[PDB]
Amino acid sequence: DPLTTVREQCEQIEKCIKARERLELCDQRVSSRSQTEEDCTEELFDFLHARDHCVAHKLFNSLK
Amino acid sequence: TDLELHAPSYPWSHRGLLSSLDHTSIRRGFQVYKQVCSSCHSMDYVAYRHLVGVCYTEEEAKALAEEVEVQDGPNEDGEMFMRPGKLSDYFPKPYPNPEAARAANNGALPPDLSYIVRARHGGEDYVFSLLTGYCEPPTGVSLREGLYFNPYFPGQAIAMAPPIYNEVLEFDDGTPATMSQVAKDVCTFLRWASEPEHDHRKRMGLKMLMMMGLLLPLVYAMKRHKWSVLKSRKLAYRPPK
Amino acid sequence: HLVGVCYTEEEAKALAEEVEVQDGPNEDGEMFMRPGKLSDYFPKPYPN
Amino acid sequence: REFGHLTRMRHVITYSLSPFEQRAFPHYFTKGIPNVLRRTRACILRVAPPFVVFYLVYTWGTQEFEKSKRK
Amino acid sequence: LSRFLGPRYRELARNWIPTASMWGAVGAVGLVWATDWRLILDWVPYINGKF
Amino acid sequence: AVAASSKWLEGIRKWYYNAAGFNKLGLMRDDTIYEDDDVKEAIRRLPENLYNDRVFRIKRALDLTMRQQILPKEQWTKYEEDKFYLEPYLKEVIRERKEREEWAKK
Amino acid sequence: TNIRKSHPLMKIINNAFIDLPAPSNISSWWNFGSLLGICLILQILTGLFLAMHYTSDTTTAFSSVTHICRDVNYGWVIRYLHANGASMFFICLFIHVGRGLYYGSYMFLETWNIGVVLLFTVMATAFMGYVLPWGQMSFWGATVITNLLSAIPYIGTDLVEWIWGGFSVDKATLTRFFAFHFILPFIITALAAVHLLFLHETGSNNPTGISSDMDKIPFHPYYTIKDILGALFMMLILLILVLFSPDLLGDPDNYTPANPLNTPPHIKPEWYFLFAYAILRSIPNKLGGVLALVASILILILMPMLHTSKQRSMMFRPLSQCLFWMLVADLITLTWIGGQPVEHPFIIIGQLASILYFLIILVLMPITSIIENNLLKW
Ligand code: HEC
Ligand code: HEM
Numbered sequence: 001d002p003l004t005t006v007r008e009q010c011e012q013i014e015k016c017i018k019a020r021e022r023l024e025l026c027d028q029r030v031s032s033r034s035q036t037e038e039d040c041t042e043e044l045f046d047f048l049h050a051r052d053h054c055v056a057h058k059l060f061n062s063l064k
Numbered sequence: 065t066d067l068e069l070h071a072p073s074y075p076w077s078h079r080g081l082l083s084s085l086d087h088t089s090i091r092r093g094f095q096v097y098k099q100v101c102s103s104c105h106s107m108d109y110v111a112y113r114h115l116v117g118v119c120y121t122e123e124e125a126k127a128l129a130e131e132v133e134v135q136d137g138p139n140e141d142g143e144m145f146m147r148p149g150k151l152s153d154y155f156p157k158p159y160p161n162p163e164a165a166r167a168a169n170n171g172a173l174p175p176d177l178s179y180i181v182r183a184r185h186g187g188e189d190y191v192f193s194l195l196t197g198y199c200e201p202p203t204g205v206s207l208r209e210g211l212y213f214n215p216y217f218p219g220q221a222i223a224m225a226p227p228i229y230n231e232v233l234e235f236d237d238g239t240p241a242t243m244s245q246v247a248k249d250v251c252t253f254l255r256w257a258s259e260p261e262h263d264h265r266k267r268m269g270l271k272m273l274m275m276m277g278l279l280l281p282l283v284y285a286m287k288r289h290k291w292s293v294l295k296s297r298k299l300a301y302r303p304p305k
Numbered sequence: 306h307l308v309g310v311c312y313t314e315e316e317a318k319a320l321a322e323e324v325e326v327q328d329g330p331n332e333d334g335e336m337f338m339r340p341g342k343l344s345d346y347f348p349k350p351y352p353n
Numbered sequence: 354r355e356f357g358h359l360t361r362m363r364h365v366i367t368y369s370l371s372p373f374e375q376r377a378f379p380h381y382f383t384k385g386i387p388n389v390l391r392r393t394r395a396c397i398l399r400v401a402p403p404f405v406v407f408y409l410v411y412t413w414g415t416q417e418f419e420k421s422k423r424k
Numbered sequence: 425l426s427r428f429l430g431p432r433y434r435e436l437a438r439n440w441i442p443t444a445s446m447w448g449a450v451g452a453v454g455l456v457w458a459t460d461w462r463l464i465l466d467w468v469p470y471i472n473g474k475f
Numbered sequence: 476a477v478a479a480s481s482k483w484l485e486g487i488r489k490w491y492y493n494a495a496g497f498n499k500l501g502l503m504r505d506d507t508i509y510e511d512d513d514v515k516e517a518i519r520r521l522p523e524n525l526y527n528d529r530v531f532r533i534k535r536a537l538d539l540t541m542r543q544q545i546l547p548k549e550q551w552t553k554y555e556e557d558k559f560y561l562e563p564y565l566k567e568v569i570r571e572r573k574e575r576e577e578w579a580k581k
Numbered sequence: 582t583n584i585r586k587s588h589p590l591m592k593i594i595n596n597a598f599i600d601l602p603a604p605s606n607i608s609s610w611w612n613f614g615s616l617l618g619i620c621l622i623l624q625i626l627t628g629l630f631l632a633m634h635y636t637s638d639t640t641t642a643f644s645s646v647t648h649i650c651r652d653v654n655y656g657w658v659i660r661y662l663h664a665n666g667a668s669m670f671f672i673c674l675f676i677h678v679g680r681g682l683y684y685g686s687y688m689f690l691e692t693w694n695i696g697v698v699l700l701f702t703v704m705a706t707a708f709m710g711y712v713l714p715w716g717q718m719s720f721w722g723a724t725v726i727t728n729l730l731s732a733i734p735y736i737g738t739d740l741v742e743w744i745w746g747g748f749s750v751d752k753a754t755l756t757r758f759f760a761f762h763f764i765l766p767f768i769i770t771a772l773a774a775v776h777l778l779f780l781h782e783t784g785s786n787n788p789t790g791i792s793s794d795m796d797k798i799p800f801h802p803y804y805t806i807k808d809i810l811g812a813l814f815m816m817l818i819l820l821i822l823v824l825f826s827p828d829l830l831g832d833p834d835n836y837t838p839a840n841p842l843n844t845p846p847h848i849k850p851e852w853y854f855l856f857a858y859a860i861l862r863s864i865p866n867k868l869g870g871v872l873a874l875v876a877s878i879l880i881l882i883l884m885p886m887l888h889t890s891k892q893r894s895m896m897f898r899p900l901s902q903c904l905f906w907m908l909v910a911d912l913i914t915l916t917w918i919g920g921q922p923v924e925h926p927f928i929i930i931g932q933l934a935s936i937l938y939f940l941i942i943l944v945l946m947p948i949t950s951i952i953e954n955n956l957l958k959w
């Protein structure tokens with residue numbers, strides 16, 4: 001319950017939006033043709049690494 | 065070919081050099097192990113004599129191991145006479161067919177937990193960041209049926225289905241049982257389990273630093289006193305001309 | 306330890322595949338019976 | 354090798370003072386701080402340039418390891 | 425280098441190289457029973473030394 | 476033995492004399508030699524005034540290194556004042572060792 | 582009538598520690614010889630405890646060590662005193678060897694050669710102590726030694742089978758590794774008394790490289806109080822690593838138990854073997870890699886023969902000081918490479934740094950001393 005609201009404002013950081021937008025720019029690249037195994041685990045690692053950094057700075061105040 | 069994700073740094077309440085453990089968050093964290101799991105994970109090195117003093121007095125530890133019923137030894141004309149557990153026990157173990165119980169888990173056996181934060185490259189920051197970090201499988205990643213996409217896993221597809229939602233549990237004192245109050249208490253557990261000497265070596269480290277603050281400038285004063293004879297001497301050369 | 310002293314190794318296993326003692330457990334089951342596995346001490350009579 | 358059988362020496366005089374007649378701590382920051390700066394300057398061009406080249410190889414070696422697993 | 429140069433150095437080493445197989449072959453017989461060298465106990469048919 | 480680099484290679488010799496620092500402790504070049512058996516025979520053959528000068532210069536330099544100090548710059552040993560007092564005695568000791576070695580093989 | 586000059590046992594102690602003539606300008610780099618004697622005694626009164634409560638078998642080794650940290654009283658402090666006390670021994674050994682290399686102490690030929698024997702014996706001992714706890718790093722680190730030990734073309738296949746207890750990974754493997762680890766620290770204690778008896782014939786070298794027979798002082802009280810102060814500063818650093826971060830020097834994957842269960846994410850030993858593991862791993866031949874492992878430690882015996890300078894130490898040799906610190910920076914590179922995976926940038930780097938370690942000692946150091954001889958007009 002505090003995690004799902006702390007994770008909300010951590011996405012509108014400018015370091016986290018341009019890790020999100022070309023994750024979804026590559027979404028319509030995989031299901032377009034048949035000659036591909038271009039996965040999206042590289043595009044999602046940079047999202048979660050930029051995001052979960054700022055979550056750890058703030059989450060432990062709202063707990064215990 | 066793909067990269068890996070490492071857990072960030074969480075400001076634990078025992079992260080400092082002279083910081084103790086919180087003795088209420090281990091009390092709440094034993095029960096996130098006691099009745100959310102032990103259906104997959106043993107902890108084959110901790111007993112209920114290890115829980116008295118840390119977080120219980122002995123009566124609340126005596127009342128447990130009577131929620132479990134394990135198989136004791138033999139007698140004459142009875143064969144495997146049993147009992148509920150004593151407090152000197154590794155209380156149950158989970159699944160039979162040992163080391164091949166992966167048929168219950170689709171070819172991947174979950175490991176023991178009594179040394180799991182010492183055995184990882186993240187400590188208890190890794191256990192927290194994987195237990196609360198499930199995602200949906202992204203585009204192009206095909207999954208064998210029985211795999212769940214966890215980005216904090218080396219193989220990127222753990223056979224772990226997520227074990228916690230919100231209020232799988234309710235504590236004894238009255239505490240909200242959200243998914244982050246969960247897994248913060250069981251990660252203050254599983255670290256005391258790996259290192260039960262945590263608060264004892266930090267209090268002994270304080271007494272060491274105060275004695276060496278007395279013993280060292282005084283031995284350096286005795287050395288400085290003897291060596292001042294050589295440090296102050298003068299030399300002269302007077303040959304016959 | 307009886308082989309070469311007073312028996313050869315056949316004539317020896319057949320005396321071990323004559324008594325029935327309790328082995329350990331196996332999954333999809335419990336404590337089962339499997340007789341002499343060529344290396345077994347001599348069976349006691351009393352359980353206590 | 355005992356003390357009166359070591360070597361031959363002539364025409365040398367030494368003067369000394371008792372340890373109870375002097376200060377155990379003479380000039381400490383007046384003499385000592387400009388002395389440890391002369392010793393640092395005299396050895397810095399011999400010791401330090403090898404460890405700079407280890408630093409440049411270490412940065413090139415960890416950055417070209419990650420610009421191989423990327424795509 | 426003229427460190428160990430000379431016709432004297434290999435003159436005493438001329439008359440010792442007959443008894444300098446007391447350096448190498450003595451090491452070769454010094455590791456027959458200290459080692460149990462397995463495939464060079466059939467150097468002779470004579471050593472059936474272990475049962 | 477090059478006449479074009481007569482002054483240039485003496486600049487590298489004077490630079491190396493100051494980069495090495497036995498002159499800051501008041502030492503001469505022959506004070507710093509490693510004493511093997513040929514050097515120990517040349518010390519025994521020195522006249523009595525050159526022996527006593529060498530013993531005091533070494534003792535004064537060992538005392539400076541104990542204190543981690545050096546001499547004032549006006550008391551440093553100059554480059555064109557360094558006397559190679561041991562080199563004639565050492566060339567004769569080595570020539571005698573090489574004579575006893577050609578005799579032992581011929 | 583002075584009893585410390587005439588009693589048969591007291592006069593041995595007096596000549597060794599009390600009335601011994603010593604140079605007056607001896608630095609703090611000469612402290613690490615008595616520190617090595619403190620670390621060796623400490624590893625004996627702490628290995629007493631661990632071998633008491635111990636069982637060495639393929640079924641119970643990983644649990645016999647976890648019994649001591651929790652159940653055995655005062656066992657967490659003594660176990661991590663022993664694991665960090667061996668890291669302390671190896672840092673006091675590399676300082677000690679680099680001192681004698683820098684100041685030309687290898688010219689004491691008999692003392693230097695017993696030292697090279699002492700460096701081999703503690704290296705082989707500590708290898709047979711990390712195999713005892715039986716984790717992932719214990720298994721996969723031991724099973725790369727025997728691949729290069731069975732590469733010995735005649736006797737090697739029956740050599741490894743004689744030391745593995747008899748077949749392979751089994752109960753009795755850890756009865757010959759444990760036997761070769763209880764008794765090897767006592768050959769070191771007898772080799773250290775012989776090591777000091779040869780040094781007593783000449784006395785000590787000093788930082789200038791010049792003989793100091795005109796400036797000797799007694800050992801007591803000047804260096805007895807200086808060796809006690811330096812040992813107190815060593816106990817402060819050791820108890821800080823034990824009481825504040827007892828797992829800083831270590832690997833978490835050796836808490837995962839040993840089994841041929843699965844290949845580990847990496848294979849790496851302790852920090853004081855990472856320079857040696859990096860050299861053999863950069864040779865794609867299991868005979869060429871076991872020869873360059875022994876040639877990286879036994880190359881120290883050629884240091885008296887390769888000396889071409891007219892001076893003894895490196896205090897007045899500025900061109901040779903640059904090469905000494907290039908060698909130290911080359912061993913830092915091999916310690917980093919030896920904990921890296923075998924990938925693209927860490928093979929060309931790890932094999933050029935293996936070449937430069939031998940090029941400095943054999944070729945570059947004897948030529949540079951000759952160049953400095955010509956510049957001083959001898
Ligand atoms: C749905 C069953 C299940 C539940 C319940 C469960 N896990 Fe697991 N877990 C698994 C499986 C399956 C594995 C084996 C991983 C593999 O080999 O893919 C595993 C392994 C693990 C690992 C090791 C992962 C790694 O990266 O090494 C950790 C840590 C772990 N479990 C923690 C927990 C904790 C803490 C809980 C209690 C909140 C828990 N698990 C509850 C399924 C479960
Ligand atoms: C268990 C290992 C060792 C012990 C206990 C030990 C002990 C000592 C002691 C007490 C001294 C005299 C004090 C000092 O100068 O520090 C000394 C000096 C010396 N040691 Fe060691 N040592 C060990 C290993 C080695 C090694 C590995 C080497 C070289 C490869 C070595 C070579 C020397 C030399 C050359 C000296 C004389 C140095 C000098 O006077 O300048 N020793 N040792």
Ligand code: HEM
Nearest residue numbers: 624625628629631632635664667707710711713714763766
């Ligand atoms: C030169 C001295 C010594 C060195 C360098 C040394 C090194 C080591 C090392 C590296 C370990 C492994 C610890 C770990 O990985 O957790 C260890 C532990 C061990 N040592 Fe030693 N040791 C020395 C002395 C001794 C002595 C004197 C004994 C026996 C009397 C001994 C017996 C053992 C045993 C049984 C272990 C068990 C594993 C453990 O408890 O961690 N060692 N030592």
Ligand SMILES: COC(=O)N(OC)c1ccccc1COc1ccn(-c2ccc(Cl)cc2)n1
Nearest residue numbers: 704705708711712718722849850851854857858
């Ligand atoms: C603390 O133990 C480890 O680090 N061990 O061994 C269990 C380990 C663990 C994992 C991988 C490799 C090793 C060993 O790697 C090396 C590399 C060189 N030596 C060596 C050993 C003895 C001698 Cl004489 C000379 C060289 N060992």
